[PDB]
């Protein structure tokens, strides 16, 4: 998955966004975030050494 | 109760049919009575003091 | 075309939503704890709130009855006709049952024998004790004429028997019991029929096609049994194994033909006919009610605030409407509307009179209170303030001292959870003291007094202690009568009564008496 | 004044009763000190600000 950093209002936080690509993760993030009046700050890939 | 009935029998004390509800001065306060008022229901005979 | 934006949009336009509504619509990728619990914070930063079918049955009932088509002036006559056709059919079905007549005759034998009253056996026939005593003999006569015709000429007299039995209006309870008896008898018939059936098809291996072939029309005789099994059929020779059971259980089957005075063929027909009639009746009557369901609401809208819910009112009123449909006859020409109105209103009022109170009071009490409430209206501004408490009932037809009590119990109790002053969590019932409790001080003094009295009783003689304990409930259950004391004490009567007075004296002196003296506060 | 207008206007009155000063309620009076008495006790109504 991908952790998308969303920031709005008085504070910020990260939400999981599942996708097959970083770019796709960004698109799926924005499409599922921006229109609500939420800003999309950052997108990070999930590491987790296994 | 039995013990109380024994007590009544020995000391010959009539158990009153009337409980004492009387208004008494609250504990700790010592005043001087400066006045008394008696309010009587309309139709009920006034007492002596009243 | 966003899920989140839809959630937030609902939560913006409305502004204001509940946890569940937010849980309903969530991002495809958010199912878990920190993924919601934080989204709430997100939402509770802007447009902040946290906490078809509209539920409340006031709607659903209104719609469901909103479906039903209103009747027509002529349609009422159609439905009522269906009713008449329906009922009297089951009445005739009752009249054609021998045990139904014999039961009536026997119960009347119990009436004249003073083992029961008339009110329980009859409401009157088409209408006096003498007239009853005779008409009943008419019934009995038409019975005793048809009883001897059991030999093709009987079908003629059975008609008249039905006629005279029909002329009786039975007490509803009795009629119900009759119908019940009939259907139960039918259930017995089915018991034997099914028992015999399962011993052939379900066990003995034989088709229901062949089984019912020789069954219908006899079922009592051995024509289908002793004259059958030898037929050389695949299902024939298999019938030898159970042949005992069926033949043993057949006795009751032919016994029913005696008890009821009808062949097994006839019974089923009569009771089935009755079932058809009953079903027809209820089928029309329900249809009558459903059309008039609106009237009930229209009436109930008057009685709203009397302490019963809207739907309670409309339901009790619905029951009233049902009663109206049950007791109505179109042949009287009375308009069903203005008729049923009074019934519905009656059910409503009678119900409110009952269940709207925490402490339920009799009807005449409610009425008596009402009259006082009405009298207190006219003298309100007439007396310049309000009529004196002892001037109301003067106009009433009663001793007038009731006004107090009547005005007392009538007041409904105050909710124990009623918020008291300070507007805090302090509630009325929180300030209710427990009087019924025995304070610990007194409970200790009682123990000390027990020990004390015990000690004082340890000082007397063994027999004095025994008799003084026996006279009272001291350290024993059920204090004994002065004679019983002697019964346990051998020597009896005036003896014991003396020792008592002898004990009290010894315990009267300020040596033994000084210890428990202070308990006399 | 209870006026009953004659049916089918122009509006005159068939009859009208002037019935005399119907008493509705008593109202609390303010003392010369700007206080009321609710029960046996001087009461003050605080001026609001809205």
Curated annotation (Swiss-Prot), chain A:
Keywords: Bacterial host gene expression shutoff by virus, Bacterial host transcription shutoff by virus, Host gene expression shutoff by virus, Host-virus interaction. It comes from the Viruses. GO terms for biological process: symbiont-mediated suppression of host gene expression; symbiont-mediated suppression of host transcription. Interacts with host RpoC; this interaction inhibits host RNA polymerase activity. Acts as an inhibitor of bacterial RNA polymerase by interacting with RpoC subunit and thus preventing promoter recognition by RpoE. Non-DNA-binding transcription factor that plays a role in the transcriptional switch that abolishes transcription of the viral early genes (class I) by the host RNA polymerase but allows transcription of late genes (class II and class III) by T7 RNA polymerase. This is Bacterial RNA polymerase inhibitor. It comes from Escherichia phage T7. The lineage of its organism: Viruses, Duplodnaviria, Heunggongvirae, Uroviricota, Caudoviricetes. The chain holds residues 15 to 64 of 64 of the full protein.
From Swiss-Prot, chain C:
Signal peptide: none annotated. Residues 1-51 are annotated as: Sigma-70 factor domain-1. It is found in: Cytoplasm. InterPro entries: RNA_pol_sigma-70_dom, RNA_pol_sigma70, RNA_pol_sigma70_r1_2, RNA_pol_sigma70_r2, RNA_pol_sigma70_r3, RNA_pol_sigma70_r4, RNA_pol_sigma_70_non-ess, RNA_pol_sigma_70_r1_1. A motif (Interaction with polymerase core subunit RpoC) lies at residues 312-315. Contains 4 domains, connected by flexible linkers. In the active conformation, the domains are in an extended conformation, each making extensive interactions with the RNA polymerase catalytic core. NCBIfam families: PRK05658.1 (NF004208), RpoD_Cterm (TIGR02393), sigma70-ECF (TIGR02937). This is RNA polymerase sigma factor RpoD.
């Amino acid at each position: 998955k991908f952790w998308a950093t969303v920031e709005s209002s008085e504070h910020s936080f990260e939400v999981p966004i599942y996708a097959e690509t970083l770019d796709e993760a960004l698109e799926l993030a924005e499409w599922q975030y921006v229109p609500a009046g939420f800003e999309v700050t950052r997108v990070r890939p999930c590491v987790a050494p296994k | 109760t039995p013990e109380e009935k024994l007590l009544r029998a020995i000391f010959g004390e009539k158990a009153s049919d009337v409980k004492d509800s009387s208004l008494r001065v609250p504990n700790g306060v010592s005043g001087t009575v400066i006045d008394v008022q008696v309010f009587t229901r309309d139709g009920v005979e006034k007492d002596k003091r009243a | 075309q966003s899920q989140l934006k839809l959630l937030v949009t609902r939560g913006k336009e409305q502004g204001y939503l509940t946890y569940a509504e937010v849980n309903d619509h969530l991002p495809e990728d958010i199912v878990d704890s920190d993924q919601i619990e934080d989204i709430i914070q997100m939402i509770n930063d802007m447009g902040i709130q946290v906490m078809g079918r509209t539920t409340d049955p006031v709607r659903m009932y209104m719609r469901e009855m909103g479906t039903v088509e209103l009747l027509t002036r002529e349609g009422e006559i159609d439905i009522a006709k269906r009713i008449e056709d329906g009922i009297n059919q089951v009445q005739c079905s009752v009249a054609e049952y021998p045990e139904a007549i014999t039961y009536l005759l026997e119960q009347y034998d119990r009436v004249e024998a003073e083992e029961a009253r008339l009110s329980d056996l009859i409401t009157g026939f088409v209408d006096d004790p003498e007239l009853a005593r005779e008409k009943f003999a008419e019934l009995r006569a038409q019975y005793v004429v048809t009883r001897d015709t059991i030999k093709a000429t009987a079908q003629e007299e059975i008609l008249k028997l039905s006629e005279v039995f029909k002329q009786f209006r039975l007490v509803p309870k009795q009629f119900d019991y009759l119908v019940n008896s009939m259907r139960v008898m039918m259930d017995r018939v089915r018991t034997q029929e099914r028992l015999i059936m399962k011993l052939c098809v379900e066990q003995c291996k034989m088709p229901k096609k062949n089984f019912i072939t020789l069954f219908t029309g006899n079922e009592t005789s051995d024509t289908w049994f002793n004259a059958a099994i030898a037929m050389n059929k695949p299902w024939s020779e298999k019938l030898h194994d159970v042949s005992e059971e069926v033949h043993r259980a057949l006795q009751k089957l032919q016994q029913i033909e005696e008890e009821t005075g009808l062949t097994i063929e006839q019974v089923k027909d009569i009771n089935r006919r009755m079932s058809i009639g009953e079903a027809k009746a209820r089928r029309a009557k329900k249809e009558m009610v459903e059309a008039n369901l609106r009237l009930v609401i229209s009436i109930a809208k008057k009685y709203t605030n009397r302490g019963l819910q809207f739907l309670d009112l409309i339901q009790e009123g619905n029951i009233g409407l049902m009663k109206a449909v049950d007791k109505f006859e179109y042949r009287r020409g009375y308009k069903f509307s203005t008729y049923a109105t009074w019934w519905i209103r009656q059910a409503i009022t009678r119900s409110i009179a009952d269940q709207a109170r925490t402490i339920r009071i009799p009807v005449h009490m409610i009425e008596t209170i009402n009259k006082l409430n009405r009298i207190s209206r006219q003298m309100l501004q007439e007396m310049g303030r309000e009529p004196t408490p002892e001037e109301l009932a003067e106009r009433m037809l009663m001793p007038e001292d009731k006004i107090r009590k009547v005005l007392k119990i009538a007041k409904e109790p105050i909710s124990m959870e009623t918020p008291i002053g300070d507007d805090e969590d302090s509630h009325l019932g929180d300030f209710i003291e427990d009087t019924t409790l025995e304070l610990p001080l007194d409970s200790a003094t009682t123990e000390s007094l027990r020990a004390a009295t015990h000690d004082v009783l340890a000082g007397l003689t063994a027999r004095e202690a025994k008799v003084l304990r026996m006279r009272f409930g001291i350290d024993m259950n059920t204090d004994y009568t002065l004679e019983e004391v002697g019964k346990q004490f051998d020597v009896t009567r005036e003896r014991i009564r003396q020792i008592e007075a002898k004990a009290l004296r010894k315990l009267r002196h300020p040596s033994r008496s000084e210890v428990l003296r202070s308990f006399l506060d | 004044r209870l006026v009953i207008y004659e049916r089918e206007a122009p509006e005159g009155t068939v009859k009208d009763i002037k019935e005399q000063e119907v008493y509705m309620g008593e109202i609390p009076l303010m003392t010369d000190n700007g206080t009321f008495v609710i029960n046996g006790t001087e009461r003050v109504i605080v001026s609001q600000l809205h």
